[PDB]
Amino acid sequence: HMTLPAFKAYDIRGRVPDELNEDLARRIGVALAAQLDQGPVVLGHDVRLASPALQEALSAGLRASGRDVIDIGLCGTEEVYFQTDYLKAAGGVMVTASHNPMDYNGMKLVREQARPISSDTGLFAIRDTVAADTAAPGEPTASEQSRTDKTAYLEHLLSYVDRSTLKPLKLVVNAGNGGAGLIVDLLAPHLPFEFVRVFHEPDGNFPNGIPNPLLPENRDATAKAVKDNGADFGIAWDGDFDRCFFFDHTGRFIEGYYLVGLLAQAILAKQPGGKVVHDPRLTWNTVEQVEEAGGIPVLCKSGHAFIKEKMRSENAVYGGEMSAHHYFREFAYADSGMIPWLLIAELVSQSGRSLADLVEARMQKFPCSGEINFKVADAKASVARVMEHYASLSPELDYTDGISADFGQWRFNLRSSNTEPLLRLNVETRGDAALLETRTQEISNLLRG
Numbered sequence: 128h129m130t131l132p133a134f135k136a137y138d139i140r141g142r143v144p145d146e147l148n149e150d151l152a153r154r155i156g157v158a159l160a161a162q163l164d165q166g167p168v169v170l171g172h173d174v175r176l177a178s179p180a181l182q183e184a185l186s187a188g189l190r191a192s193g194r195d196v197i198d199i200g201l202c203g204t205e206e207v208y209f210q211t212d213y214l215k216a217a218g219g220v221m222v223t224a225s226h227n228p229m230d231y232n233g234m235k236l237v238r239e240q241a242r243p244i245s246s247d248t249g250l251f252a253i254r255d256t257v258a259a260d261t262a263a264p265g266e267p268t269a270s271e272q273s274r275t276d277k278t279a280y281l282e283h284l285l286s287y288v289d290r291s292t293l294k295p296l297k298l299v300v301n302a303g304n305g306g307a308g309l310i311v312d313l314l315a316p317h318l319p320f321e322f323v324r325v326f327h328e329p330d331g332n333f334p335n336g337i338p339n340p341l342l343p344e345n346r347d348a349t350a351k352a353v354k355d356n357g358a359d360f361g362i363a364w365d366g367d368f369d370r371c372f373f374f375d376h377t378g379r380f381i382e383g384y385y386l387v388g389l390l391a392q393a394i395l396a397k398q399p400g401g402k403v404v405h406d407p408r409l410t411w412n413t414v415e416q417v418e419e420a421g422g423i424p425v426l427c428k429s430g431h432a433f434i435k436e437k438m439r440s441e442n443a444v445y446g447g448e449m450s451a452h453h454y455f456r457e458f459a460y461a462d463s464g465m466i467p468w469l470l471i472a473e474l475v476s477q478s479g480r481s482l483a484d485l486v487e488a489r490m491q492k493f494p495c496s497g498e499i500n501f502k503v504a505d506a507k508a509s510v511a512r513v514m515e516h517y518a519s520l521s522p523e524l525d526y527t528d529g530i531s532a533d534f535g536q537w538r539f540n541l542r543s544s545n546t547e548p549l550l551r552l553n554v555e556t557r558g559d560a561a562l563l564e565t566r567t568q569e570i571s572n573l574l575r576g
């Protein structure tokens with residue numbers, strides 16, 4: 128190691144204790160106080176066993192540096208965003224391991240208005256300060272307040288729907304033993320739905336596996352609950368529930384791409400003429416649904432930091448990525464795993480259409496490969512092999528995010544990830560499932576060549 132490995136492009140992410148530990152966390156608290164504007168700092172943590180001790184150590188460093196700390200307790204990542212913005216805090220840290228293994232933990236850090244702190248926007252500056260900090264730990268000169276009250280947060284979630292138009296839908300909810308079920312249970316007295324709770328209790332030992340609804344084994348536990356109970360649809364979250372995943376009444380998991388266009392229609396029904404931000408991986412369906420609903424689609428590099436700053440600069444009401452991230456202007460421009468399914472339940476209620484029928488024609492019109500990852504020996508040479516092969520067809524190329532190639536009736540995007548050393552492929556066609564398969568396989572053989 129020449130730099131601390133735990134400092135990634137968007138967050139802190141490491142194995143405990145050799146990459147992340149209480150001493151590093153206290154130092155991160157100290158260094159964070161130097162980076163922020165004036166004001167207190169919001170702290171919350173996910174269900175992982177070692178997360179509270181990491182939070183305390185962060186608090187001690189912050190308070191040794193004269194920063195008041197607001198402990199919002201066990202929460203979702205979105206509650207740190209919301210409370211940071213709502214309480215007008217100088218910043219906030221969520222202690223969350225996402226879905227890294229049991230010996231891993233991490234942190235996501237924000238400044239004022241829950242604006243992200245990323246490698247090029249202060250995270251590496253913090254890393255460097257932490258790397259050179261051999262000062263003795265100081266003693267606390269500021270106080271910690273514990274603010275468990277979620278009333279403003281819950282009231283804010285409910286303001287996105289017209290509760291008198293909601294029908295008593297039967298919804299499977301799968302927290303994966305993460306944190307989402309505690310918010311579900313607080314929302315439920317204000318909602319008419321019948322909840323079928325699966326893997327509902329928070330448990331950092333994760334008896335049913337680490338929360339990841341994308342893994343087919345975890346996917347199926349929600350699907351089975353929906354089919355067996357005749358639920359209208361199902362929702363599963365990751366551990367810190369800033370990501371949500373939808374299953375229609377047939378148990379079929381809905382590919383995240385189609386939720387962007389769906390949520391944009393939902394939002395644009397109340398906010399006419401608004402702008403919608405989306406990523407370049409999959410586009411054609413979103414552009415059409417947004418335009419069809421009176422909205423303005425705004426193409427943006429994928430990544431939550433790019434999406435957010437593009438949303439701010441354009442006053443976009445909603446931003447959506449195909450990878451289960453949905454951002455809402457009214458929500459500090461931050462992502463939420465809760466707003467999306469409230470908006471979907473409202474849409475099903477008002478329209479009388481199943482979730483399946485709301486997306487069926489879209490999925491037939493713009494079939495997509497899903498995101499396919501490639502670990503190759505030479506990413507640059509592999510990309511070149513793909514572009515060389517297709518050059519004679521003269522595709523329209525865009526480099527907003529890696530390479531986007533539009534051939535008319537099909538297109539692809541091919542990116543390197545900013546969180547993993549991989550190539551990520553996405554293909555879509557204009558209503559052609561055969562073309563989608565032959566092109567996807569063609570590109571795959573090229574990448575694996």
Ligand SMILES: O=P(O)(O)C[C@H]1O[C@H](CO)[C@@H](O)[C@H](O)[C@@H]1F
Nearest residue numbers: 429430431448450544545546547
């Ligand atoms: O590995 P990628 O594709 O570089 C980054 C991933 O994590 C980011 C932040 O959470 C997301 O905004 C993004 O859409 C994706 F899922």
Ligand SMILES: [Mg+2]
Nearest residue numbers: 365367369370
């Ligand atoms: Mg998450």
